[PDB]
Design an enzyme around this catalytic site. Structure first.
Site: not given
Length: 104
Positions: A31, A34
């Site tokens: 991600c 993230c």
């Protein structure tokens, strides 16, 4: 930045921090948002030692992610006295700070 390997690890951190706010960062290694917000959360952990910060890699700890209905990466879930008190998703630094302020 407690890494939580199982849903049981989450239940434990909760028991060991009862009145304290816990911020759980559900994330994935793949991600981009993230990985982008990750250093910010780490910095916050140091700025605010009165709050417990933890991370759940949703691919590794699929049980916790399921138990918290986490689908969007990152999802930040806020827990105090064993109850979920807030959540939101996204690499949203302002919303992270406001939510921590709200519940600490």
């Amino acid at each position: 930045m407690r890494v939580l390997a199982t849903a049981a690890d989450l239940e434990k951190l909760i028991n060991e921090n009862k009145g304290r706010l816990i911020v759980v960062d559900f994330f994935a290694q793949w991600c981009g948002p993230c990985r982008n917000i990750a250093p910010k959360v780490e910095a916050l952990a140091k700025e605010i030692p009165e709050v417990e910060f933890a991370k759940v890699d949703v691919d590794q700890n699929e049980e916790a992610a399921a138990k918290y209905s986490v689908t969007a990466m990152p999802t930040f879930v806020f827990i105090k006295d064993g109850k979920e008190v807030d959540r939101f998703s996204g690499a949203n630094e302002t919303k992270l700070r406001e939510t921590i302020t709200r519940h600490k």
